[PDB]
Amino acid sequence: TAEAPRINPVGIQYLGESLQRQVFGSCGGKDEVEQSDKLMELSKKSLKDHGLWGKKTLITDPISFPLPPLQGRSLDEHFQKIGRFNSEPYKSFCEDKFTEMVARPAEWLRKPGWVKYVPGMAPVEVAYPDEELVVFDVETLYNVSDYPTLATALSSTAWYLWCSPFICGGDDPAALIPLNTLNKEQVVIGHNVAYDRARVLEEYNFRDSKAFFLDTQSLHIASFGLCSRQRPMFMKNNKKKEAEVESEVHPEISIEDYDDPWLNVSALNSLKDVAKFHCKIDLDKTDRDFFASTDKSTIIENFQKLVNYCATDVTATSQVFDKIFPVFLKKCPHPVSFAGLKSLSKCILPTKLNDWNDYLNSSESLYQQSKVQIESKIVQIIKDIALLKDKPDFYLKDPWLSQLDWTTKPLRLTKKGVPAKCQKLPGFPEWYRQLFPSKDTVEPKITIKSRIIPILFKLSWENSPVIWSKESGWCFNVPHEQVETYKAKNYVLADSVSQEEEEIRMNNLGLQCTGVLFKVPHPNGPTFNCTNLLTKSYNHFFEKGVLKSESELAHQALQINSSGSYWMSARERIQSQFVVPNCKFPNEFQSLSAKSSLNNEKTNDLAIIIPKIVPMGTITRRAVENTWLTASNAKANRIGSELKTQVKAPPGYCFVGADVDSEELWIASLVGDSIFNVHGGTAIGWMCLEGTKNEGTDLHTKTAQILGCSRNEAKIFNYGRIYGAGAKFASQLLKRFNPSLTDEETKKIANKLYENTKGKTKRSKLFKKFWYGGSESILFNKLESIAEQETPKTPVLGCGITYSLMKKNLRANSFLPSRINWAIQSSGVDYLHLLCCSMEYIIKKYNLEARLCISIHDEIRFLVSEKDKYRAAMALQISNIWTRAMFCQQMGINELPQNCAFFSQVDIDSVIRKEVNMDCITPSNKTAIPHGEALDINQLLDKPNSKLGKPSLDIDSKVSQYAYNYREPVFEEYNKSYTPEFLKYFLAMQVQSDKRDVNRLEDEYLRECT
DNA sequence: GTGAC
DNA sequence: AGACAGTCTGCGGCGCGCGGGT
DNA sequence: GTCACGACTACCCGCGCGCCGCAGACTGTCT
Ligand SMILES: Nc1ncnc2c1ncn2[C@H]1C[C@H](O)[C@@H](COP(=O)(O)OP(=O)(O)OP(=O)(O)O)O1
Ligand SMILES: [Mg+2]
Known part of the structure; x- marks a missing residue:
């Protein structure tokens, strides 16, 4: 009859036979159990100490459906080969870049369009630069319009200058720079390059582009940290600079450099500071006021000076990049990082103009009234x-x-x-x-x-x-x-x-x-x-x-x-966005699908906004946006909170989106369970995996029901207890959630919860300080231990940490909590990069009509036509299961639980909101929005026209050319330091509940070691 | 200052 | 008819509290 | 009955308000 479920010694279900065969192939781990039995005994004891032994879990029928095949014998081979496939030929252009720089022309000519200068020859007029790699910089008159005024480009052979018609005898300032990005593959390097990308003519298309815009600021931040720890660590740098500037003499002996060596390996984010630090160039900034004028006759004079200034900026940027780039290649050597960096550098926001103006007018009017x-x-x-x-x-x-x-x-x-x-x-x-x-x-x-x-x-x-x-x-x-x-x-x-x-x-x-x-x-x-x-x-x-x-x-x-x-906080940023309409550029707004089939009726009001995204703006390698990743959600009494509903899809298209469930708690539970090699080996891991969101039996919901608060407040409380908050702050949080409570009640509840959760502490000379007796003691000890290594790396992809937070540059002011957080918060970036790479590969292979629209952290959205919506949902599910299998296999376990394999909900809609069944009524918006659709895995499988079609044969042939190199995992490198006797005695002591037993075990270890 | 020696 | 020494009078930079997001 | 440092959620964005250091104009003897 039906297939029988497979269950561990602990009541946890695994995948079916077909999914196991198509995901993990054939594997065998019977030999570990002979060593694992003692660990199982210890785990059993822990499960009996907290009363979770024999308790029932959720068991459901197995799921089986065919999947696309893998490109290797393991997931690492598959992901490396797909990463090399997705990273070319831009990676080849990034290398072999020129070093020597050609000479500068004596005189510049004022002529509209693109003019090319070659040393020894006459200047020529061109339509496009038509170059593989250039260094680019743009200047504009911001007090007059949002459109550019002039631009310059440097290549290995020639110089290029672009001049706008507005300064050549014209009264219309609406113009854009052309670069032929829809047909020619190229790499454009710049400092804060999104601002320059926003001024390119051919970037205003729904059809995908073929150019890669690369930013030096992200590389500098990701490599050197910039002492951006958002603590007075950033203040000491400024204070030391002020002290050095104030002093007119430089003594041979230096004070406070012995205490804080990291002061000598840091700078600021601005281009002048980066150039002064790396390349020792003094870059003067005096002419920037000339572009604040209102009259354009000022720009007509002093033309040569401004052009020379912009070219000097280009030269400085090139010299900085030529030093920064190999270091970034050294710290992050996996191709998936480069592929994700390329994927996150191209985003688009389709909107409408009149609705945007009306929303702005109403939002301002109510506030002033x-x-x-x-x-x-x-x-x-x-x-x-x-x-x-x-x-x-x-x-x-x-x-x-x-x-x-x-x-x-x-x-x-x-x-x-x-x-x-x-x-x-x-x-x-x-x-x-x-x-x-x-x-x-x-x-x-x-x-x-x-x-x-x-x-x-x-x-x-x-x-x-x-x-x-x-x-x-x-x-x-x-x-x-x-x-x-x-x-x-x-x-x-x-x-x-x-x-x-x-x-x-x-x-x-x-x-x-x-x-x-x-x-x-x-x-x-x-x-x-x-x-x-x-x-x-x-x-x-x-x-x-x-x-x-x-x-x-x-x-x-x-x-x-x-x-x-919130309007008082964000009005200037909301009202200063750059919106480009359809009526001004009638030959640009092309559809995503090649077969347009006309249907241009009722499409007379369309617009596109290009976001200004810095791909790596944090020490944890996260992206930064000042407006669209800080936007509020819709609320009944908040003015102007309907911002994200202004993004609308053109006729014939829709949005398909997803968000990851309980992300970093799962990563921490996996790190904790890696010691026991079996899922559910710890109490917190068993508590996390017992239920699902759709049944209302997740850990956040249980915490909210016990504490009598909402689910978001439970999320705050749970993410606060982890990462090192005290009991007094927890009592204050409980007071703020429920303001009718008494101080003693909250203190007693917080004390009892912390006693049940963390346990007690012991100090010994041999084993330093360690927690014991709690349900999360092992996780806390492991998180403390992995942050004190000489060379910390991410457990999944092996990315390195900044120089500012390494041990050899610190003697005081250890900055411990950020070093504890860094690995857990940085694993999410690798998760997102893997998801993006998988989606790109599937879209390229099966010829789907889809393109990434926006990615807010662990939430992602795509713009998909009406025909290929369910195929996009299926591809999202396949990407999720591949990413989770990759995470499980890297940390040493060749199995995956069935409950956490798939997304809980997949959303199909026409606007961007958090939940499909939301009216989004605000004080400024009086019209309800019709609801969307949300689907789970079984409802998706029940519907027709959701199956992938015939694939292209040449894609796999192109993928098969690339190479594979075996590498050793991070935790296997970490495990080499400790002798097994130390590990087994430490693990035995961490599960005890009394001081006498731990002391007896320490005495036995001392007798055994001799 | 405070649970641990 | 200046010289200059007190003698006010605003004007701009800085830090901190306070809100939004994952 | 002493003791020896512990103890601490994290990562981002930005505005208004009080406070204090100065540049500048105005009497008022003074030559
Ligand atoms: N106060 C916070 N403190 C620390 N990390 C946070 C906080 N809020 C959100 N995050 C982090 C942890 C999350 O795993 C991660 C993803 O954000 P988020 O989706 O809101 O949480 P979640 O994934 O656990 O809930 P859900 O299952 O509903 O999606 O961002
Ligand atoms: Mg989530």
Whole structure:
């Protein structure tokens, strides 16, 4: 009948016979079990200590369907051969690059288009440079338009200059530089090259391009780190540079270089600093103001100077690249890294123009309408208050109005005449004067973020007025009788200095002391001070009634603060995007499919945005985007949060997308389970693999149900406990999730959870310090151990770490937590690169009509026509299973669990959102969007027209030419240092639950070693 | 300052 | 009719709190 | 009954507000 499931000694299911044969081929691991039996016993003991032995898991029928064959006897051979296939011929052009540079022409000619100069010959006019490799730089007049003005290119033989018609006697500034990227394969090298790519004429096509734009900044960051640890490590570099510039003498003996050697191997990200560091070139930056002008006649003069400046920039960039590139080849030697770098350097965003303009208009209009309306009333209140200065008796009794500086200076008199020398407001109180910045200002300025607002809005805490102090922040007065009682409420007294200042101010104003000052609590802790009382996390106190106001505008101010902060943060970046319409370039916007079959109706409003993506902008080799990878999600009360819904597909096309499930937790569990060689050998690995997302039995959901919070808050809590957070911070997090709890309750819960999770600690001379008795002790010990190696490498692809964070460059300020995080956060980049390479290979092999659109970390999307949508989903599933099998085989296990093999959901839609069934109603958008479609593996297999067709025979013939070289895995290199007796005794001690047993094992080891 | 020696 | 020494008067750079994302 | 350093989520982007160091114009004796 049906096939029977296969189960380990632990109740975990594996793949079926067909999937096993097509993925892992034939393998045998029977010989390890004889050594593994002791480990199994240890694992069994651990599983009995936490009560997970004999507990049932999820068992389902096996899945079997045919797959495309592999190109080697192992996954490493397959991936290396496909990487060499996808990396050519750009890799050959990157090498054999010229070293000597040709001479510069004496005079430049002003002529529209492309002009080529060859030493010894006359200048010529050309249509395209038509070169394999060039170095490129672009200049533009940004205050006039977004279109380029001039450009220069350098090759191995000649020089090229491109001039716009706008500076050659024209009134139309809309022009783009042509390079024939749709038919000629080429490599263009530049510094921040995306900004230059955005100004190329033939890049505005839905059909794929054939040019590779390479960036030196990403190579420099990935190689040298730039001390970009986002800690005052970055501050010490600037401080040391300031100290060196201040000193006019250079002593032979150097102080603080012994303590911090890494100060000598770092620079900044700007091109001038990189050139000064690597190539010792002093690059002057003075002419950059000439491109800030409004009149174009300025550019007509000083033409030769500007062209020479741009050519000097080109020369510096070439000399920097010729030194940077071999180092990058040395640190990252796997072809998949280069293929992923090429894949992530080409992205496109199709939009529409009128919708974008309407969205911008509404988003600005609502914001200004709210802001002006509230500010008018605040100014009116200030005007009414400032009129009573003539009666000292009325305001000297008010508890709030008595804290203002009611002092007036005399009017100056010069030679018995009016001086009239910049006197802003004579004979007025000081608090009123400070509102006006200068004499020209006629109306006082005020904002809800000002400091005197809790004085203008009479605020009370526990039915007591608030008092501003110098040393502390906001405080309130409690009489002597109840001082002990409020100590039961865990409030904290202020320091003695503020007490003395309060005493002297009350003696100056002429009253007697009746109590003491208590501090308003702060969310972070008792040490921090409170400075603002109208921000987030004070709304709950306003709802309860602890914070009270005598004015109705406090609640409206809180609403306005909650509603319009993200627009205030991102308006300038959102409104300054470069959008190119269809009506201006009618010969460019070509369709993805060759058989267009006309159908140009109702397509009169189309646009394309090219993002400015830095492929490697972090120490962990992640990509950086300032606008599109920092975009908010749609919310019911947030203005302008519908940004990502503005990306729309043209008629006849759609978006197919996916996102990886529980990514880095799975990687950490795999690292922890690699010691025992069996999936589920540790308690956390067994807890992670028991259920699936579709049944609502994942670890994040269970944590949320136990803690009584949402799933995102559970994700934060779980990712906070790992990477080294304390119990006090966990208690503060629990307080912030549920603000109705008591301090002791949260402390007890956090203490119990940390005791159950991590365990206890032991210090021994032989085995240093180690955790024991917990369900995640082995994982913590392994993560601590792998970060102290001499040459740290990524376990999957073998990428190296930056020079700034290596051991030999550090004697103090170890920066330990980043070195702990680095490997786990850097494995995701390799995951993404493998996924992209697999998708590119499948698309090229089976002639699908698809192209990558956007990749936000572990989320990816593709633009696919209506005919090949389910084939694209199938290719995504195959890529996922290949990547997971690669990860499992590299770490030493030749099996894969069935539950984690495939994506949970695959999304097909027409816009970009997080969930298909979202109306996306915002305060600025009043129209709902129809829902999309989401599919799992069984529903995908049930549908027709989802099967791949006939393949091309020549692709495999081209792939088979490349070579394969065997390499040894990273953990196998790591395991050579330790003797097996040390390992077995350490593993035996890590699973014990009492100090006496560990001491006995240490004594037995000491007796055995002799 | 605080669980471990 | 300058000389110059006090004597204010704003103006710009810097750090920090506070929000968005995986 | 002492003790010896431990202890610490991570990676990115950017704006408004208070604070302080200076460049510049204005009297006022002074020659
Ligand atoms: N506060 C955070 N701290 C550390 N890492 C985080 C944090 N938030 C997100 N990440 C990291 C860990 C994730 O594995 C990785 C991918 O992001 P994300 O998809 O949001 O988490 P996830 O994959 O575990 O949940 P899900 O299964 O719903 O996709 O980014
Ligand atoms: Mg995910």
